[PDB]
Structure formats: structure tokens, C-alpha cells
Amino acid sequence: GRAFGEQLLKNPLIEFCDSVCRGCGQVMFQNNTVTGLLFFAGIFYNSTTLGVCAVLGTAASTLTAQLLGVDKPLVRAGLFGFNGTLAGIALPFFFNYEPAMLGYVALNGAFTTIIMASLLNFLGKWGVPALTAPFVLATWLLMFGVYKLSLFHPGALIAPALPSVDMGTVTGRTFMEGLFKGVGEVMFQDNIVTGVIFVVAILVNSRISALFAVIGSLVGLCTALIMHSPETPVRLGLYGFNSVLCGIAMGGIFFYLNIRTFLYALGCMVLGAIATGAFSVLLSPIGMPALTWPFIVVTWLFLFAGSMFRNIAQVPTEKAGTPEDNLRSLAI
């Protein structure tokens, strides 16, 4: 809603950085520069090394899109940044440092941009978004081969084992830590304050999305408890973060918020937590993380199914903004 003359003040660098910050915001579907800026602040609050590498990943993917000539509106909306943000954080989260790390992060970010284009072309025929599939698929391709290609060394989170069947103790701590690390863990941030920062950041762009961030973390948490997860992963928000994404996407962004789409959102948040155990098990023989594949698979299923259900009012993806903006234009 800004004065059109402000366009005279633009230059490639500042346009690039605005694209980078919107890119970061889009990790949680928030097309907002200030939201991306506060996401970065939250990460930097936890780890300077992770923040630099988030920025580098978002920059590499955004630049690659511009180099290949993606349509300017797609780039300006940060749709070619968010997968690069995650691609940048995931690598130093899971693998030990080597000098090559920064080069591999740039590569991983560049690759997300290819796959983002692939999936917009593939999925666009049904009006379905790519979500974080570009980040997951690129990262898996760059991570899985580490046992055969030793440049990097995996961290202690990466331990191949056949799955098998202690339980810990649920406390108030499980809930307060689970809630906010569930949000933080969307960006691999094992930090309660970063998690609060993340909610505040979404709140700047959209209050409804901030609430669904909170709801999803909670529904993921207690679904995992009802399903008898040990407490440790729950407290750590490992069953919240896919459900956070599920909540934000289904909660008024890709569907017009009402009672019915709310209940539909809830089914998707519950199944996202259950799919988290499923995919963790699937990849355990090779020791690899499922990342946000749970959110992606379950949310894709609910998105594809939308147009078949008369009682569930989808938002056309090309139009889809904040939940509030969505309801404002429906009522016009």
C-alpha cells in the first residue's frame, strides 16, 4: 500500500535484500519483510553461525532464481528464498563443520531453486503449492550420500539402525518447552525464546496465522502424547514443527477460515504429527531426518483433496494471502 513514487528510490541491492527477507518470511508462509527480519533475529539470537548460513542459503537460492530468470513477481514474493533459508540451516545442524560447508550451503540453496521451479511447473496444473518439498528433496540428495562421500561427517543425530520398540515423565515443562521449540524447530532452532520471537514475527503479518502457529505446535505435542511418544522428543518440539506448518497453511491461507475448514485444518495437524513418527521410522535404517516431509505429504493430500469437497472452500493459490486478507476479499 506504499506510495508509488517510492519505486524511484529502488536499486538492485535493496530489492535483493527485500526479496531475501520476504524469502525468510515465507518459511512460514508470511510474505512480509519485517517477519523475515524478525525470523533472522530469532535465529541469530540462538546461533550466529546458523543465522549467517540461513542468510547465505536464502541469498544463494534467490540469486540463482534471478540468474536463471524466474518471473520477477515469484522472486519478489520470496517464493524462491524460503527453501534456501532451510537448506542453509539444515546442513550445519546435522553435519559437523568443514571449510567446504559454506560452498555446500550455496549449492544446496541453488538446488532448491531448481526444484521449486520443477514443482511449480508440475503441481501448478492443479493449483497446488510446492511447500518445503524443494528444501527437503535437495537436502536429502546432498545429505544421504555422506556415508559414501566423506567430505562432511554426520553429527551424532545421524545414526543408522533398524527400528525397534525409556518413556520419561510429562510435566508442565513438556508443555511450555514443547510449545515454543515446536515453533523454533520449523527452522532447526532448539531455543524457546527463538520460538517466541517466531510467533511475534508471524503476529506482525497476521494474528490468525500466529494463533495457528501456536495451535499446530500444541496439537502436534498432545497427539504425540496421546500416541505414547517418549516425553523427550515431545519436550524438544520434534512433534510440533510439522504440525505448525500444517496449521499455518491450512488455517486460512489455502482455505478460507471457517468452522469447517478449521476442523479440516485440525485433521491435517493431527496426521502431520502421526506422519512424523512414520517418516522418522522409514528413514531410520539410513539414519536420516525426515525434515518437513511429514507436513509436505499430509498437507499436499489435504490440498489436492480440497476441490473435491464442496463443504471445504479452497483459496485459489495465485490469490492466497494472509488469513485476514483472504476473508476480506471473499466478503467483497
Interaction residues for a copy of itself, span 253-272 (CB under 8 A): 264, 267, 270-271
169 is a contact residue toward a copy of itself (CB under 8 A): no
Q: Per CB under 5 A, does 92 bind Au ion?
A: yes
Helix 12-25 × helix 33-46 angle, to 10°: 70
Q: Does 170 bind a copy of itself (CB under 8 A)?
A: no
Q: Which one, 53 or 213, has the nearer CB to Au ion?
A: 53
Query: Of 20-28, 38-46, 157-165, 246-254, which segment contacts a copy of itself by CB under 8 A?
Result: 157-165
- Nearest 5°: phi and psi at 314? -70, 145
Rounded Cα distance between 51 and 46, Å, is 8
User: Cα–Cα distance between 276 and 278 in angstroms, integer?
Assistant: 5
In the chain, helix, strand, coil percent, each to 5? 70, 0, 30
12 contact, one of a copy of itself, Au ion, none, CB 5-8 Å limit per kind:
none
d(CA 136, CA 115): 10
**300 interacts with a copy of itself by CB under 8 A:** yes
Q: 20 contacts which partner out of a copy of itself, Au ion, none, CB within 5 to 8 A by kind?
A: Au ion
Amino acid at 211: L
Say whether residue 149 binds a copy of itself (CB under 8 A): yes
Pairwise CA distance, residues 240 & 220, whole Å: 4
Binding-residue pattern over the window 84 to 103 for a copy of itself, x denoting contact by CB under 8 A: --------------------
Q: Please state, in angstroms and rounded to a whole number, the distance separating the CA atoms of residues 53 and 138.
A: 16
Residue corresponding to grid cell 508440475: 122
Minimum CB distance to Au ion smaller for 20 or for 238: 20
Q: Which of Au ion, a copy of itself, none lies near 17, with the C-beta cut-off 5 to 8 A by kind?
A: Au ion
**Residue range at the interface with Au ion (CB under 5 A); choices 221-229, 266-274, 278-286, 289-297:** 221-229
141 sits near a copy of itself (criterion: CB under 8 A): yes
